[PDB]
């Protein structure tokens, strides 16, 4: 709800006024949020990636893709073509609704702030909050005494520098141990 409505009126004027952009539309915008568990654990057992997707879906708000391996050699020699990761990808209303369940709920329910002290960005203006465990789930009876697994929160922006890019995000207010 409120995030895209807030970005529209406030974050576009704020960034325009602080950075004096050449034309208003050149304010940085929010480009897709991709989430992603990655493997978690356990290639071999080959059940758990299908359980990982069914956990991830609830807080994604869409089915996970189930990414499979490229040529691979890391913590095991995965070869190529095995199932491995998870992957989501959001934009528009789905992302703006998501970005409100982040920030409002999920971040204040992380106890020690592994989710954000100081954290730094890519080479241009994209960022990646690797959350440690389990956040919140839809209506009721959230906990089923599961098997942990955090996830990458890779949020993306159209922005030209990481110094500029953190004026964005911060205009929606960003963490209390930051």
């Amino acid at each position: 709800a409120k995030l895209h409505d807030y970005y529209k009126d406030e974050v576009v004027k704020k960034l325009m006024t602080e950075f004096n952009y050449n034309s208003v539309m050149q304010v940085p915008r929010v480009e897709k949020i991709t989430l992603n568990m990655g493997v978690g654990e356990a290639i071999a057992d080959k059940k758990l990636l299908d359980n990982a997707a069914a956990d991830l879906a609830a807080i994604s708000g869409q089915k996970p893709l189930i990414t499979k391996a490229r040529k691979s050699v890391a913590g095991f020699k995965i070869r190529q073509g095995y199932p491995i990761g998870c992957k989501v990808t959001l934009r528009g209303e789905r992302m703006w609704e998501f970005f409100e369940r982040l920030i409002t709920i999920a971040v204040p329910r992380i106890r020690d702030f592994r989710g954000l002290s100081a954290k730094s960005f890519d080479g241009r203006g994209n960022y990646s909050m690797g959350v440690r465990e389990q956040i919140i789930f839809p209506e009721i009876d959230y906990d089923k005494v599961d098997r942990v697994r955090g996830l990458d929160i890779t949020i993306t922006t159209t922005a030209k520098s990481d110094e500029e890019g953190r004026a964005l995000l911060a205009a929606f207010d960003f963490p209390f141990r930051k």
């Binding site: 609704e97 920030i103 409002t104 709920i105 971040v107 204040p108 839809p138």
Partner: protein, 70 residues
């Protein structure tokens, strides 16, 4: 947004204004602001003299008149 990717999005959209009582808000959690150490220990606390917890009744100088007929 194909039809069969089943979000729970009616529930996830629903119940949307949550209180400070109901689910804490983002108006709670910066409140204990900073991580605080004070290195001016006891005995740096202006205490150059010390005394125990309690027993503070009847304080005067009496030089060991405590035995009952020794």
């Amino acid at each position: 947004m194909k039809k069969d990717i089943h979000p729970k999005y009616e529930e996830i959209t629903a119940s949307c204004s949550c209180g400070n009582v109901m689910k804490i808000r983002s108006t709670v959690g910066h409140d204990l602001n900073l991580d605080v150490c004070s290195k001016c220990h006891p005995f740096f606390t202006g205490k150059q003299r010390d005394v125990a917890t309690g027993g503070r009744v009847d304080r005067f100088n009496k030089r060991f008149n405590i035995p009952g007929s020794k």
